[PDB]
Curated annotation (Swiss-Prot), chains B, D:
Whole-protein coverage range: 630 to 847 of 2185
Subunit structure: Interacts with capsid protein VP0, and capsid protein VP3 to form heterotrimeric protomers. Five protomers subsequently associate to form pentamers which serve as building blocks for the capsid. Interacts with capsid protein VP2, capsid protein VP3 and capsid protein VP4 following cleavage of capsid protein VP0. Interacts with host CD55. Interacts with host CXADR.
Lineage per the UniProt record: Viruses, Riboviria, Orthornavirae, Pisuviricota, Pisoniviricetes
The protein, known as: Capsid protein VP1
Locations listed in the record: Virion; Host cytoplasm
Purpose: Forms an icosahedral capsid of pseudo T=3 symmetry with capsid proteins VP2 and VP3. The capsid is 300 Angstroms in diameter, composed of 60 copies of each capsid protein and enclosing the viral positive strand RNA genome. Capsid protein VP1 mainly forms the vertices of the capsid. Capsid protein VP1 interacts with host CD55 and CXADR to provide virion attachment to target host cells. This attachment induces virion internalization. Tyrosine kinases are probably involved in the entry process. After binding to its receptor, the capsid undergoes conformational changes.
Residues annotated as transmembrane: none
Length: 245, 218, 225, 218, 245
């Protein structure tokens, strides 16, 4: 049997058992300086924003979506980021994947905080175009990016673009997806940052990475892809007060 | 509140219009009581399988002077007789028959220029409900017609001129109104969709399900 | 003034033509109708695909779904006026509503995916508010009142659209009604089937009524010729 | 005591006079219910913005023998039918149409020589009050005319001769009386001052404020 | 001494005695059909919208501002009218006028409901351009508008464009402004309409007329005009629910 979770206008279908993964044992609650720093909360912003689906094929390295940037163009969240300046928010990823019993694979859904990416050329830093992809996921690469006089972000799948071992990414809140057992993944991310409030257009709070460790395999005749689908809901988001004390 | 069957099936509907004269071949009217002739009321009645009701008949009789050349006219007041023949009762073969005098046919005499004549007929079925639809044969033998139960017989209605008023020709038209009362309905069934053809059967011409549109995304 | 006149809509007592006659007592026959609203509360299959020769066949009811060429394409769409609308004017609901000149209430819509037990996909059922126009793309539809329907878990999705009322007097036929909402379906994900399983599948729709439904000023039916 | 709205807006006012015949091109009458044609009642109604009331319609039908040369006449009694078409209802295109028989239009049959026919119409607005004045457009689009809300539709009124009495020509005139009942009025507004021009709009010709005098000390 | 009335972001200065004129003895309260007709209220919409000032000179007939149309382009009220369809609202006019002790005149501030205007040509009706003026007041006229084949709204000051006596406009909620005593006028208008909710783009609820009965007079050397200033605040405004029962 399935379930339905209605947040505002949106409604989404989920399994009775969802095994939610709270980020660091902390639920994204509100903020606990009077007139000097007034703050105003926004509620309607909370709702289920469904991003474009991505086709998972046999030759598919991986994907990455910056959580503040991805919704920077959709509904109130896209608007509020343009109007208010300082804002703090928490998230609830809902990576769902549908494939038959005759498909086989494995995916790692990991929420990485402060994922500072590397650059092909050691001398310079990556351009925001090759770093930020709006209304569309950014893909990894199998072979290393050719270095030269360019600002291409390093995108090899094994180094993960942060220059670490991709087998150790488990340290961060994560969840595996075995196409023979688990079919979805839920991760609740609290607000992780040095400051109580930060500018949302100049700093990405969390990064969502989905990398297939085991390649998708199927027999000739089955559907030749698997449509991974991501749903993001901003949680307990508050912004600065534009009033006058 | 307006959707109760008492408010949905209790509208005065005109179900018959004819004309009879004081002279000539046409001299009387006849109409076997049957509610399937007017399609506007038939379609409403055919929302349910078995309906039990009572009837209030209202007759509007108007006489016009037929064009003629008979000189020295001076008409008197016209009197009409509407004889309602109950199921299994004698029926007239002509205007000046001896069946118009029978006492078991409740005829009503009405003199021209008053409030219209009106009589109420009770539930006349020997069974417990009239059957809008019948899935059987009238008789056990092959001779019996299909879908015509002999249990929905409401009788017949004959009208005439008691006397010839003047010496000239006069034509009188009679309109009959049907008003069901105390209506109980059982087993609702789907609307007609198709158009009606005859009054005796459910025969129809196959038609589409609905009206078309440019596309499925339109 | 107002006496010695025959008014068709009057309730008076009439002299019985045949008195002293014992009418047969009533019996218990199952399924006695009390109000017409109960009939309008039975789900009826909706001919969504009334396109061309589809009406004169049985495929008018079924809605075709194809996995190929549907990354984000619209599956179907129709305005939300029951009576007076090609898709709903002939259902039970529409046929009851074509008798009254004034009707307001809420409509229930049920979609049943009729495919293999091994097919999985997602759909994006969106509801446009009366004044707002039908969505151009999948994003526009998402930024509204949508319901993401997964056919692997649930085989049937139910909606309950409110603010449904009479939009015109007499009878009108028009696509894209100004004071009525639009229900549209978008392919969030494609149909994923294993080997030896048909990927072409069909959907069906059922329209019903609700407790909060009113119907006033009964008139003639326009389907009689 | 005589200034209560019940005593100020409950006077039988004649709002329509026409004539129909049993022969010839003119054979029936029609009049969309609207109270803005008689200026004496319109000016009283226009003291308030929203008024909610009920209507008592009285019809005075009189028939005169049109001059003719048809010999050997002997008329019968004339019967008239006044059919009141409720809002959103079918309207006749001719005298002998099939719309006169519809059951949802409450027609009243009246035979010449009795008390005048009379019927009462209840509040027919789908809203909560009729709007004497409207400061909007009938439709959202530019096509919609200004100041004409489609919520003050009281229906239409058709009359005819049920039958042709004699062989000669006869012309029958029908006078309609308007009597509002149970009148409630809201938001009083100033009197007209200017004269009325049309029945559909508040268009007017600019006029002086009052009548003049010789001097300010006169 | 003066006072300050802070509604939301806006703040306005008023006299200690304001002699407010409640429209029909009724304060514009909220609405007192379940799931069939859901309704949602909007609050931030309430605030002080200050319209452009108008210069009152010796040869000045009058002005007129349609209350729903005037704010159709300003802030949330202009936006909400485009998004939601049905809406009911109440108003609080704040016509203020500042002139010295050496100026003399008199103004009538009247809120007229369903002010259906006339047309120069009897045959047709006035065009919406000559009827509705957005972000700008519409002026009356001294002499009659020449009739012809045009859709010019009748705008003579004495007939008032509604074809009545301008001395009888007092029947409606009003207030006089004597330049030697009163300096402002406050009128609270409840929601007056046949229906609970109405479309705001197709129907004007109230009309604000400001007509000078006595001409402005001043001696050579004083400022040759008087800047009338109008402030409108939408009150208890609610709109239809766009959710799904």
């Amino acid at each position: 049997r399935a379930r339905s979770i209605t947040l505002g206008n949106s409604t989404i279908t989920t399994q009775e058992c969802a095994n939610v993964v709270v980020g660091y044992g902390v639920w994204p609650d509100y903020l606990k300086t009077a007139e000097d720093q007034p703050t105003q909360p926004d509620v309607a912003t909370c709702r289920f924003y469904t991003l474009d689906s991505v086709q998972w094929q046999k030759t598919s390295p991986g994907w990455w979506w910056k959580l503040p940037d991805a919704l920077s163009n959709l509904g109130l969240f896209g608007q509020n980021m343009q109007y208010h300046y300082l804002g703090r928010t928490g998230y609830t990823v809902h990576v769902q994947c549908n494939a038959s019993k005759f498909h086989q694979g494995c995916l790692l859904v990991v929420c990485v905080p402060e994922a500072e990416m590397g650059c092909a050329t050691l001398d310079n830093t990556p351009s925001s175009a090759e770093l930020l992809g709006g209304d569309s996921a950014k893909e990894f690469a199998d072979k290393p990016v050719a270095s030269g006089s360019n600002k291409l972000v390093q995108r090899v799948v094994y180094n993960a673009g942060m220059g670490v071992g991709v087998g150790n990414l488990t340290i961060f809140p994560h969840q595996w997806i075995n196409l023979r057992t688990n079919n979805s993944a839920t991760i609740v991310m609290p607000y992780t940052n040095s400051v109580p409030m930060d500018n949302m257009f100049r700093h990405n709070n969390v990064t969502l990475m989905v990398i297939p460790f085991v390649p998708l395999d199927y027999c000739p005749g089955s559907t030749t892809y698997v449509p991974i689908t991501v749903t993001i809901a901003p949680m307990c988001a508050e912004y600065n007060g534009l009033r006058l004390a | 509140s307006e959707s109760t069957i008492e408010n949905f099936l209790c509208r005065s509907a005109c179900v018959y219009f004819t004309e009879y004269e004081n002279s000539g071949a046409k001299r009387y009217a006849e109409w076997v009581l049957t509610p399937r002739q007017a399609a506007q009321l038939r379609r409403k009645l055919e929302f349910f399988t078995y309906v039990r009701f009572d009837l209030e008949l209202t007759f509007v009789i108007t006489s016009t002077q037929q064009p003629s050349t008979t000189q020295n006219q001076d008409a008197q007041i016209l009197t009409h007789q509407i004889m309602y023949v109950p199921p299994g009762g004698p029926v007239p073969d002509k205007v000046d028959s001896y069946v118009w005098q029978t006492s078991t046919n409740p005829s009503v005499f009405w003199t021209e220029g008053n409030a219209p004549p009106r009589m109420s007929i009770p539930f006349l079925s020997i069974g417990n409900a009239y059957s809008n639809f019948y899935d059987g044969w009238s008789e056990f033998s092959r001779n019996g017609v299909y879908g015509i139960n002999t249990l929905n017989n409401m009788g017949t209605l004959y009208a005439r001129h008691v006397n010839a008023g003047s010496t000239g020709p006069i034509k009188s038209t009679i309109r009959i109104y049907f008003k069901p009362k105390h209506v109980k309905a059982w087993i609702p069934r789907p609307p007609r969709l198709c158009q009606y053809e005859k009054a005796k059967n459910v025969n129809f011409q196959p038609s589409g399900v609905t009206t078309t549109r440019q596309s499925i995304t339109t | 003034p107002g006496s010695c006149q025959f008014l068709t809509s009057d309730d008076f007592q009439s002299p019985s033509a045949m008195p002293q006659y014992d009418v047969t007592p009533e019996m218990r026959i199952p399924g006695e109708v009390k109000n017409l609203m109960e009939i309008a509360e039975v789900d009826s299959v909706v001919p969504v695909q009334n396109v061309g020769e589809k009406v004169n066949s049985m495929e008018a009811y079924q809605i075709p779904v194809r996995s190929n060429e549907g990354s984000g394409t619209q599956v179907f769409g129709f305005p939300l006026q029951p009576g007076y609308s090609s898709v709903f004017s002939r259902t039970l609901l529409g046929e009851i509503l074509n008798y009254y000149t004034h009707w307001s209430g809420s409509i229930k819509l049920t979609f049943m995916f009729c495919g293999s037990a091994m097919a999985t996909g997602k759909f994006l059922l969106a509801y446009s508010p009366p004044g707002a126009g039908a969505p151009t793309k999948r994003v526009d539809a998402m930024l509204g009142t949508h319901v993401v329907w997964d056919v692997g878990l649930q085989s049937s999705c139910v909606l309950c659209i409110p603010w449904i009322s009479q939009t015109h007097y007499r009878y009108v036929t028009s696509d894209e009604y100004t004071a009525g909402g639009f229900i549209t379906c978008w392919y969030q994900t494609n149909i994923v089937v294993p080997a030896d399983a048909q990927s072409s599948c069909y959907i069906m729709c059922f329209v019903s009524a609700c407790n909060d439904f009113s119907v006033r000023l009964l008139k003639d039916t326009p389907f009689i010729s």
